[PDB]
């Protein structure tokens, strides 16, 4: 099909390390974005079959979505906040490089990204 398997969500052999920043990313940042009116296209991997995007997974080399980020946080996949933040940035970047500027999905992504950046400004030190 046009769709790959979803990204891995468990980090093999990685010891558990909890931090305030990771708790904030899961319970504040991701929660706020997930509940936003524009979150739904980003809550699971892009469905290239349903949307008829034959080249999506040719163009986008590192797929990412909020569902994957959520599971990664829950599984303590990330060693630090910066790794989690990079996955969010990849998600937004993928949208901006694939979709025509001005498309609904791009406007939605931009709104979510503005909120993301506001919440990351209050990341614990």
């Amino acid at each position: 099909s046009m769709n790959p398997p979803p990204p891995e969500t468990s980090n093999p052999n990685k010891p558990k390390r909890q931090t305030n920043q990771l708790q904030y990313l899961l319970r504040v940042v991701l929660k706020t974005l997930w509940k936003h009116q524009f979150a739904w296209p980003f809550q699971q991997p892009v469905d290239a079959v349903k949307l008829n995007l034959p080249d999506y997974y040719k163009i986008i080399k590192t797929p990412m979505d909020m569902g994957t980020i959520k599971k990664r946080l829950e599984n303590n996949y990330y060693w630090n906040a910066q790794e989690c933040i990079q996955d969010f940035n990849t998600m937004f970047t993928n949208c901006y490089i694939y979709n025509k500027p001005g498309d609904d999905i791009v406007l939605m992504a931009e709104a979510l990204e503005k909120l993301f950046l506001q919440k990351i400004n209050e990341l614990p030190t």
Binding site: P41, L51, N52, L53, P54, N99, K100, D103, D104, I105
Partner: peptide, 11 residues
């Protein structure tokens, strides 16, 4: 482009 389409009907 392969647009995704609209995510809300504009009326």
């Amino acid at each position: 482009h392969f647009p995704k389409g609209i995510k809300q009907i504009k009326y």
